[PDB]
Amino acid sequence: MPKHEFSVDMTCGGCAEAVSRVLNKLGGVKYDIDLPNKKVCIESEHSMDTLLATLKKTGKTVSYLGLE
Ligand SMILES: [Ag+]
Ligand SMILES: [Ag+]
């Protein structure tokens, strides 16, 4: 399954739950949240576009980094 990596401007520890919540609501995802590197990696059949839009529902700055 594709593994898409995103920069997410996660500024505090609460952002692990925040990101977990929006991704869980989308569903069909397994992820790893790297708070120190402000990066989220998502294993999914969802498009880069669907994942980008989903992460942006947090209200944060999100950019696509590429594949893991
Ligand atoms: Ag936060
Ligand atoms: Ag947050």
CSV table of C-alpha atoms and ligand atoms in Angstrom, one decimal:
chain,number,residue,atom,x,y,z
A,1,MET,CA,0.0,0.0,0.0
A,2,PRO,CA,1.3,3.5,-0.8
A,3,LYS,CA,3.0,5.4,2.1
A,4,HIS,CA,2.5,9.2,1.7
A,5,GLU,CA,4.7,11.6,3.9
A,6,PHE,CA,3.4,15.1,4.9
A,7,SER,CA,4.9,18.1,6.8
A,8,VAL,CA,2.3,19.1,9.4
A,9,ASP,CA,3.1,22.2,11.6
A,10,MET,CA,2.4,20.3,14.9
A,11,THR,CA,3.4,22.9,17.6
A,12,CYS,CA,2.5,20.9,20.8
A,13,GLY,CA,1.9,17.3,22.1
A,14,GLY,CA,-1.9,17.6,21.7
A,15,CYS,CA,-1.4,17.4,17.9
A,16,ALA,CA,-0.8,13.5,18.1
A,17,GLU,CA,-4.5,13.1,19.2
A,18,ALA,CA,-5.7,15.9,16.8
A,19,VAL,CA,-4.1,14.2,13.7
A,20,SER,CA,-5.1,10.7,15.0
A,21,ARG,CA,-8.8,12.0,15.2
A,22,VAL,CA,-9.0,13.4,11.6
A,23,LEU,CA,-7.3,10.4,10.1
A,24,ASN,CA,-9.5,7.9,12.1
A,25,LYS,CA,-12.6,9.8,10.8
A,26,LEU,CA,-11.4,9.4,7.2
A,27,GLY,CA,-10.6,5.6,7.9
A,28,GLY,CA,-8.6,3.1,5.8
A,29,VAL,CA,-5.4,4.5,7.2
A,30,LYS,CA,-2.4,3.4,9.3
A,31,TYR,CA,0.0,6.2,10.3
A,32,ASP,CA,3.0,7.3,12.3
A,33,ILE,CA,3.2,10.8,13.8
A,34,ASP,CA,6.7,12.2,14.2
A,35,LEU,CA,6.2,15.2,16.5
A,36,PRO,CA,9.9,16.2,16.6
A,37,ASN,CA,10.2,16.4,12.7
A,38,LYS,CA,6.7,17.8,12.3
A,39,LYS,CA,5.9,14.9,9.9
A,40,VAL,CA,3.0,12.4,9.4
A,41,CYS,CA,3.4,9.3,7.3
A,42,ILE,CA,0.1,7.6,6.1
A,43,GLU,CA,-0.2,4.0,4.7
A,44,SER,CA,-3.5,4.0,2.7
A,45,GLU,CA,-5.2,3.4,-0.6
A,46,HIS,CA,-6.6,7.1,-0.3
A,47,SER,CA,-5.1,9.6,-2.8
A,48,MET,CA,-2.4,12.1,-1.8
A,49,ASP,CA,-5.2,14.8,-2.4
A,50,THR,CA,-7.6,13.1,0.0
A,51,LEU,CA,-4.9,12.8,2.7
A,52,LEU,CA,-3.8,16.4,2.2
A,53,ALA,CA,-7.4,17.7,2.5
A,54,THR,CA,-8.0,15.5,5.6
A,55,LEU,CA,-4.8,16.8,7.4
A,56,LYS,CA,-5.8,20.4,6.5
A,57,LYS,CA,-9.1,19.9,8.5
A,58,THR,CA,-6.9,20.3,11.7
A,59,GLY,CA,-6.4,24.0,10.5
A,60,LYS,CA,-2.6,23.5,10.3
A,61,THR,CA,-0.1,24.3,7.4
A,62,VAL,CA,0.3,20.9,5.5
A,63,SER,CA,2.6,20.2,2.5
A,64,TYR,CA,3.2,16.9,0.7
A,65,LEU,CA,6.8,15.5,1.1
A,66,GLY,CA,6.5,12.4,-1.1
A,67,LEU,CA,6.5,8.6,-0.7
A,68,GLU,CA,8.2,6.5,2.1
B,1,AG,AG,-0.5,20.9,19.1
B,2,AG,AG,-3.0,20.4,17.9
